[PDB]
Amino acid sequence: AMKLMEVSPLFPCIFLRRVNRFVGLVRIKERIERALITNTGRLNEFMIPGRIGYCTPKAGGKTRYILLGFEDHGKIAIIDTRLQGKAFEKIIEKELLPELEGCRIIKREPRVGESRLDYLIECSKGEIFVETKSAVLREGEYAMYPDCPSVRGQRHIKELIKLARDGKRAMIVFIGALPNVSKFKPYKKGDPKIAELLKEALEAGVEIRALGLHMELSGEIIYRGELGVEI
Numbered sequence: 001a002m003k004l005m006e007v008s009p010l011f012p013c014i015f016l017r018r019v020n021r022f023v024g025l026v027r028i029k030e031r032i033e034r035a036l037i038t039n040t041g042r043l044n045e046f047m048i049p050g051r052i053g054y055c056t057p058k059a060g061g062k063t064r065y066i067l068l069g070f071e072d073h074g075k076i077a078i079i080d081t082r083l084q085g086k087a088f089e090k091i092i093e094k095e096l097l098p099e100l101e102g103c104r105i106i107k108r109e110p111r112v113g114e115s116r117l118d119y120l121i122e123c124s125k126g127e128i129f130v131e132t133k134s135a136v137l138r139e140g141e142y143a144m145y146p147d148c149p150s151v152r153g154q155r156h157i158k159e160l161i162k163l164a165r166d167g168k169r170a171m172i173v174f175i176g177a178l179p180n181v182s183k184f185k186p187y188k189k190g191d192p193k194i195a196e197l198l199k200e201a202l203e204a205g206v207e208i209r210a211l212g213l214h215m216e217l218s219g220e221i222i223y224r225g226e227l228g229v230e231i
């Protein structure tokens, strides 16, 4: 394990209810507060009235707090996809993935086919498109994706497959931002098309990685290393 970054300040809160896919209500001390949710998943196991979450302030505009994660086995599971992405960016910056040494992000959200993928990364010998996905659904030692059907994700995997068949470099990285997981697999029930598409991706040449991450109550974000991938 090693430290990537720190989030400050971090406020414990009580999760009250999800208003819609973008917003939740939480209790912070005396106050009921609107908190941004940046994760399109159901997060049914986390979004339970009474559960302890962790928020950070947001300077402007619509909402003043971001719900970053939830208490999970004494640590914090990171649900916020923006934070997960920032953690990934630190991994790239610090060159902590040997295969991506000497590589850096040159474009964020470039258009690819009918969609956009997270990153275009430039290396010494060429470029690589990298899509990162949240994997915070737990089954024992596994982090899983997704927790419900994702058309957005089906599209992304299709564009990755097409890149690889065109002989371009393509990668999907699952961010297993849960403490105490050592492996990754697709949650077939959540989206059987995605599980089928990930198999097709492997065969086509799309590189698949999964990373273990969590946040400590201190705000420190910890990179545990890679998770064992099953597809």
Ligand SMILES: [Ca+2]
Pocket (backbone or CB within 6 Å): 109, 116, 117, 118
């Ligand atoms: Ca994206």
Ligand SMILES: [Ca+2]
Pocket (backbone or CB within 6 Å): 118, 131, 132, 133
């Ligand atoms: Ca993404």
